[model samples]
Target: MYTEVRELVNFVCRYLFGHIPRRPVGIFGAELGNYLVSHFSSTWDVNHPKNGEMKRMINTTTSLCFASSAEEAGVPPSDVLRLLPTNMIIFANPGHVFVRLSENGIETPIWIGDVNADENYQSVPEYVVRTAAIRA
Candidate 1:
């Protein structure tokens, strides 16, 4: 299962950063699907080639429900490092994208079929979401 997930993650990264154009852009997982939706501007059918081979697909549109977001909400800004939990979620709506990151730790993310043609140099990566720890 881990191997399969790895392959899928690699494929998604290649497809996204490989074809998608960028220029000093800032984005996050939430911005992934918007790129595709803005590009396709058309409804993708399950019978279509893109969906024909898909055995199952799920989409997550809410960030508040995500582990990172949950962590942000659950703990105060000053109390993240000491106590934090992580979670992995998958979303297939607006576009086919999946997030495998954790709130307590950093995980991998895979956004498939990206069409965003904007620079992401200025974009903030999700890694910054981690909490700081100060031990005495």
Candidate 2:
């Protein structure tokens, strides 16, 4: 779980960062899902700093938010989807996950099941803001 989880995150992060069409891109990191959120929102840059350009991209392009403290971040829930390219991905287990990426005119489901980060490790993101006091 630990090993594949880390690679699953790194794979998505690298993919997202490069997939953004613009230089100095913008990614709003929503801390509402599983492992990816906290990592995308915070940890990667810290651990990746040995490479200089890695530092630059993360520091410049990503923004972080959580339902617990949307007030502090000033991010409204209703309008969140309108701001980003695709929505988010939610990891269901060590074997599968879901995504909302669109191509041509067909918006479709994405599944990266099985574990081979070089090819197919599992998991995706999101459904709703499950009600409770999330710590942010």
TM-score of each prediction: 0.19, 0.25
Model 1 lDDT, full chain set? 0.33
List ranges where model 1 is wrong by over 4 Å. Answer: 1-27, 41-43, 50-136
| Candidate models: Cα lDDT each | 0.33, 0.33
> Least accurate stretch of 10 residues (summed lDDT) in model 1?
20-29
Residue 22 lDDT in model 2?
Answer: 32
User: For model 2, what is the alpha-carbon lDDT of residue 76?
Assistant: 54
lDDT of 1 by residue, 1-136 (tens): 2222333333433423523333201122233334433333344442342452222232233223222422333333223222223233443322244454433444343543332212223555555533222221
TM-score of 1: 0.19
Error of 2 at 62 (Å): 26
- RMSD of every prediction: 17.9, 17.8
Q: Write the per-residue lDDT of candidate 2 for residues 34-82, one digit (tens) a residue.
A: 4243443442222332233222121111334322223332445334333
